[PDB]
Every structure is written in C-alpha cells, then in structure tokens.
C-alpha cells in the first residue's frame, strides 16, 4: 500500500529510499548493510520499509 | 466534451434517461459509473 512519508515512530523521511532499496537487493544482495548505508540507523525508522508490504502493485494490475 | 456515465469495458461517455434502455454504445455490459464532479473537492490531510 505504498511507502509511508516520514516514519511513524521518529518522523524521519523514508519516501526516497524505496527505489534505492529494491535495487541494492536485486543486484548488490544486501539487507542490513544496504539500510546502514541508506542512513537508516536506529530500528525506529528502520522497521517502516523492511515491514512495508507494497500491495499497490497488485492493485495496479486492476482496470480503473 | 461533457460526460455522464462511462462503461466498465468500452469506456465511452454516455448519457440517458428512462426507457431509453440501460446498456452502452457497444458493450451490452450494463454497468456504468457516475463520473466525477465539476466543482473541485477539498480534502483534509487527516
């Protein structure tokens, strides 16, 4: 259901990190590290993407 | 220009009234949505 602008817990933005992440996966095969480099330190902002379930993808396969 | 209802398949703006049948300008499929408003709608980010 798309990524959440700003993390609930602390507030830090997290909109941009999406495409970046899904790439550092496909190729560079990371998790922990990718994130670390994406500047996502403390678990609070962290859990947002790693727990995000992009439903929108299946929805987009729908007509209107 | 101008639109009333559209079709679930042949998305073609229609417009009708009583007894004038309840189908579409092709597709028999008798669905049809009742298209947006002209006066813009204002929402709250809450």
């Amino acid at each position: 259901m798309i990524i959440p602008v700003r993390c609930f817990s602390c507030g830090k933005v997290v909109g941009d990190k999406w495409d970046a992440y899904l790439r550092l996966l496909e190729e560079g095969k990371q998790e922990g590290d990718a994130l670390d480099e994406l500047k996502l330190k403390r678990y609070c902002c962290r859990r947002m993407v790693l727990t995000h379930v992009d439903l929108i993808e299946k929805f987009l396969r729908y007509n209107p | 220009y101008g639109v009333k209802y559209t079709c679930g398949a042949c998305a073609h703006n229609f417009s009708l009234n009583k007894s004038d049948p309840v189908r579409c300008k092709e597709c028999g499929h008798r669905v049809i949505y009742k298209a947006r408003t002209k006066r813009m709608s204002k929402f709250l980010t809450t």
């Binding site: 798309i2 990524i3 602008v5 700003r6 993390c7 602390c10 507030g11 830090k12 933005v13 909109g15 941009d16 999406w18 495409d19 403390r42 609070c44 902002c45 929108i56 929805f59 987009l60 396969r61 729908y62 007509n63 209107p64 | 998305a11 947006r36 813009m40 709608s41 204002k42 929402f43 709250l44 980010t45 809450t46």
Partner: protein
C-alpha cells in the same frame, strides 16, 4: 568562556551533534520539545483535487502530501491566511501548486518533482518542494497503469508540529547526560554485574569513569548535555535551533508584554 557555553560536535547538512554545557537540565528539556513541537514550518493543508483515477482514495493522497517537506527559509515573514485580511487566502498569505499526471504509456510513476509553483512567493526563497535527492526528484508519490489520470492543486500554509505532525522538522532527537551513572538519577537493573551487563554508550567516551575511592558528591547538579538534532531538510539545522530559541523568545516576549498589560 564564562557562564553558559556551547560546544558543537560533528555536524553535517542533515545533522548537528553537539554538547550544551553550563546550563540546567530543565532548560535543555524545555528547548528539546520546542524544536520537536513549536517551530514554524510550512505544509499543505487544503487540497482541491480535480481528477484522480489512482487506486488510492482522495483523502488518502491528501494525507501523503501533507507530510512532504517544503522550503521554509523566509518562513518567518508570512501570516496565516486566517489572519490575513483577505477572504480565505491569497499570494500574500498562501502558496498554490498544481499537479496533473495522466497515464498514457500502457506503469507511469508520479514523483514530487512534477510540482509547479504557480502562486506568488512575495519574492522570497520559500514554499519550494525541498529536494536533496541526487537527481532532483525526492519522494515518489505513486504509480499508475494504462488510461488512469490525476489532476490536483495544492495550497501550502505555515503551522507547527502542535497543529499537526506533518510540520515538525525535527524527527528524532538524541539526549543523554552522565552516561556513567554518577548522579544516581537511576538504579540499573542487573543479574550479577551491572557494568558488564549494561552496554557502554557511545557518549561514555567523552567523560571519565566514576572512580570508587571518591565518596558520593551530592551538591552536584546536572550540567553538560550531549544531544543531536536530526533534520528532514526545509530549514538549516542551525536556524532550526535559532528560530526555536527565538520562537521561545517570542513566547518569552509576550510573556513580558502580556505581563505589562496586567500591570
């Protein structure tokens, strides 16, 4: 130098670690929340959606845009449209933006870069979709398929974190003091050894350990505080401290003004 003293630590463009010494905790905490909650910012508040074939609903999108960080450099020289003697809003008190996104290429994506700034800036850097992205298009709003359209129109306004979370430029703030529990304002939990079972904090490297032979100093109070002010963009971390000090002052101002009015 003398009484209070500042001691900036490693600072960048999106952070400012630093040490505040010779001050009472009370005031640190006070200042703490002021950044977190009472600093003027600028966020969208009214959205006049024109077209939207997205799978997301109107107010679902409305919410999203509310949080997106906008510029706020000369944010201090503007008034709330509600206070502006203009019925509703205007350039002299509001900032309007447009957005149209039609799906033609039978997955089209909608990034925040596609926003124009049709309204009057009153000639001051502000009300701009703060981009720090390398290319120039931070925060991908959403994707759409075949023939899906989407026409918006955003209006931005002042406001603060109190009024709504979608404002505050803080977003997490570190605060610690006396890493080695010497003032004993806490009683550490443990199974056998406190020191070993309790993780040393990275701030523990800037202060000397307790040292046993010394008795408990009692007349000592909480002095020196290690913080860290993260930022989302919009306002330079420094202003995000100054303006705070100032807003607090502005409050402190009326606190002195209102006072007179009661004399």
């Amino acid at each position: 130098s003398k009484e209070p003293k500042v001691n900036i630590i490693n600072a960048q463009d999106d952070e400012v670690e630093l040490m505040l010494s010779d001050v009472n905790l009370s005031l640190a905490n006070s200042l703490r929340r002021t950044m977190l909650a009472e600093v003027p910012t600028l966020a969208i508040d009214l959205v006049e959606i024109k077209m939207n074939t997205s799978v997301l609903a109107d107010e679902f999108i409305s919410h999203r845009l509310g949080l997106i960080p906008l510029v706020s450099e000369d944010v201090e020289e503007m008034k709330y449209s509600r206070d502006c003697t203009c019925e509703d809003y205007c350039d002299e008190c509001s900032v309007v933006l447009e957005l149209s996104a039609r799906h033609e290429g039978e997955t089209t994506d909608v990034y925040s870069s596609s926003l124009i700034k049709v309204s009057g800036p009153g000639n001051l850097n502000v009300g701009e979709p703060v981009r720090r992205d390398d290319y120039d298009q931070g925060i991908l709003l959403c994707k759409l398929r075949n023939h899906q359209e989407l026409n918006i129109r955003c209006i931005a306004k002042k406001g603060i974190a109190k009024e709504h979370a979608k404002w505050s430029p803080c977003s997490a703030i570190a605060f610690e003091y006396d890493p080695h529990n010497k003032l004993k304002h806490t009683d550490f939990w443990f199974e056998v050894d406190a020191k070993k079972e309790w993780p040393d904090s990275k701030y523990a490297t800037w202060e000397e350990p307790p040292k046993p032979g010394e008795v408990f100093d009692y007349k000592a109070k909480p002095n020196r505080f290690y913080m860290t002010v993260e930022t989302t963009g919009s306002l330079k971390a420094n202003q995000v401290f100054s303006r705070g000090i100032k807003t607090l002052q502005e409050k402190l101002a009326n606190v002195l003004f209102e006072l007179e009015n009661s004399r």
